[PDB]
Amino acid sequence: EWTGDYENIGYFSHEVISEFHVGQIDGGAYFCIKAVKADGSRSTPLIACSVSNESVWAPSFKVLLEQARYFYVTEQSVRIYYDHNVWTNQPFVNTFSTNALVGLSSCSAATDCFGPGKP
Amino acid sequence: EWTGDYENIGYFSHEVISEFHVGQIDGGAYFCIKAVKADGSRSTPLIACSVSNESVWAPSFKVLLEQARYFYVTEQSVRIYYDHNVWTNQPFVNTFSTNALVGLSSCSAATDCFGPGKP
Amino acid sequence: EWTGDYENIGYFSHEVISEFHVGQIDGGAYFCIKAVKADGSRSTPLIACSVSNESVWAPSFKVLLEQARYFYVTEQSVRIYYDHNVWTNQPFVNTFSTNALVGLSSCSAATDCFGPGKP
Amino acid sequence: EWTGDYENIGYFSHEVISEFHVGQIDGGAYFCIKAVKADGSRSTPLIACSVSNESVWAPSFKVLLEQARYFYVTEQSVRIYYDHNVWTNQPFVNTFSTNALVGLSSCSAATDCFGPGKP
Amino acid sequence: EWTGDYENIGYFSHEVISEFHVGQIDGGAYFCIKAVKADGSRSTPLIACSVSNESVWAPSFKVLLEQARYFYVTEQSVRIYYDHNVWTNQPFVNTFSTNALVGLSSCSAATDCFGPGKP
Amino acid sequence: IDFVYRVDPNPPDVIFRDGFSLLGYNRDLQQLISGRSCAGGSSDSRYIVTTSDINKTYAIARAYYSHSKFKGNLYRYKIRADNNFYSLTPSVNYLESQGGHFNAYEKSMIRLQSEYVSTLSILPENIQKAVALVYDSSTGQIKDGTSTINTDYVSISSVSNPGVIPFLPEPQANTQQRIDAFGSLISSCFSIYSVCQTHRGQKTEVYKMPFYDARPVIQFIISGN
């Protein structure tokens, strides 16, 4: 399992991080993202959360937190990866999404982004 | 225990972090945020303090700390989640309210404040 | 060990961190601040050190270090809470006062300073 | 091991970090940077990665990550050191590189680069 | 052992950090800085390094980095402290100097530097 | 919100005769915080930027007096805010409403720099206080010297307009640029040479400033550093 697995780990191309949530879930801390389309197109917002003590995406929680804050202070176009069907806490899945934040790119063009993608 | 529990946790929306105290209590660092409504002013200022090594919300201390600083240096209308009636040290209470700090969700104007909410 | 013990520890309000020293004493990192009044009124400055392995204020070192930097980078009004007889190293007490940085509260305008205060 | 070992650790000078990426490969997290020469003469960009738990250069992960973030936000012309033939994960090498980020030395002029260099 | 034991640790006042450097030597992630006089009358620069895993000034690394980085992003006259003849690695002491960064004051030009000068 | 304070190294007999005026025609708002129209770039601002708090004036004085190359004096000038005095907050969100891109780096320096911008030459009729800022060799802290006071002030007691800046051009999308702050995170519109300082032929030849990039520093303070 890796951030670049195009079959399992999907991405959402050029997006900008609009909102940012931090909180405490059972056991530990967590944060959530509400990235929307950078160009302003109508798309379903990519709500992706990372929990400091849940799933296999816990060891990369601190790096992802700092880099999400960096790409939130700088409203860059970012290719946000996310593992789907990760969170099982039902109240967590009602207010947020099962998408688990696993990677956060730095799209600087309109045709390609840094990081792995589907061939 | 969860930030968006909406039963034990209350929240105040559209409240910019105005003042930021930092200190040490009983052997652990702590930080309190005083926030007032960003759009004009109403009600009473909300004082919410997070103490490390104390309360069940200790693990989310640092994650909130560097986030509150972010919401302090970058004045942002945020949605502050607090756990009322958690602090018992009366000298601590007569200065800062009983509220803790459990969530800090960025919000954009009066439209779609991020983070968990109530029906 | 609260930074609200007006009987044991004092505080200087509406100061600004003018000069910032960092270093290592006795095998542990430390930082000292030179806080002067945000005017020309005061004559002698306030020297408020903080060591990361000495005395009861060590746990709040890293938390204060980031806050003091914010008040050094942004030379803004701040309430500095200090003790009186913490440091015993003779060269250290010669260079820097026995004061220990125990708290740091942002002072908004000149009407009040957040945090504990003598009534 | 050292970034100044020019016999094995190569480098490219005057390359502004153009693209950033963060994720996790296997257990620990990783971050990759794409750098193009600020002069624009070079065509093939440099792609330097760093994994927090895989390479020999793991202990320098967080510090190099912070330095990369600062050189990325400021867009300084920075000399970049990299080790060759480090990654063995085929999905990883075919996506970014076989290069490990090992040193981020700043360059304050068009002909003044600090840090180790070939004699 | 203290930054200010002027019989052992030397210092240079009103020096601007010219160029930064980060890397990794042995198991620690050293960082080096090149400093020149703010006035511009100096002839040779001073190279100061703070290897993370070695020398008695190792615990100060994490506080001497973020401070120096600041004194790099804002070119500001500071008083840099250094312990001569600390490093042993010959390739390290040919490319860089043999003195270790131990402390970083903050000068207001003229002759006012906050630290243990004692000339 | 009123009586904004501006630092200029000129004796009162010059400023109270030939006051602050526009140094150019760039009326855009994004480049004002970025310091592109203020002594760091094109330097053609249509706005004169003044602080509403006394503390930032001492910050400016300490920043300028602590480089060993600022040969000269300094003076805090009190200006009565007129209708042509707009706070920087209720002119950014509006630009953000129509499609502006004011990121956290730009948004974090209006709170730091209590900026009030005048879209008109600051005539001498608005200046009231001229307090000399002396850098005494003892204790090295800025002290208020002689306070020049004259009857040029006109009692209107007007307040700074809290609306949007009229005729403000279309907001610039994206363009994550330099912010150019000097001293201790002071936006480089408060620098002397961000004003129209040409009264005589060789009037004021002081060293301009070294401007650094502020947004790495804002990243330094907001992050765990």
Author numbering:
A (entry chain G), B (entry chain F), C (entry chain E), D (entry chain C), E (entry chain D): 1 to 119
F (entry chain B): 6 to 230
How do the authors describe this structure?
In this study, we identified and characterized a typhoid toxin-like A2B5 toxin, designated diarizonae toxin (DiaT), as a key virulence factor in Salmonella diarizonae. The DiaT genomic islet encodes two distinct B subunits, PltBd1 and PltBd2, which exhibit unique functional roles. Through genetic and functional analyses, we demonstrate that the heteropentameric assembly of PltBd1 and PltBd2 is essential for cytotoxicity, with our data suggesting PltBd1 facilitates toxin secretion and PltBd2 mediates host cell targeting. The holotoxin consists of a pentameric B subunit arrangement supporting a single PltA subunit, with the amphipathic C-terminal tail of PltA extending into the central pore formed by the B subunits.
Cryo-EM analysis resolved these structures at resolutions of 3.05 Å, 2.61 Å, and 2.94 Å, respectively. A localized distortion in the central pore was observed near Tyr70 in PltBd1, where the bulky phenolic side chain creates steric hindrance, causing contraction at this site. Pore radius measurements confirmed that the PltBd1 homopentamer exhibits the smallest pore radius with significant distortion, while the PltBd2 homopentamer displays a larger and straighter pore. Further analysis of PltA’s interactions with distinct B subunits identified a critical hydrophobic interaction between Ile227 of PltA and Ile71 of PltBd2. This interaction is weaker in the PltBd1 homopentamer due to the shorter side chain of Val73 in PltBd1. However, only PltBd1 displayed substantial binding to Neu5Gc-terminated glycans.
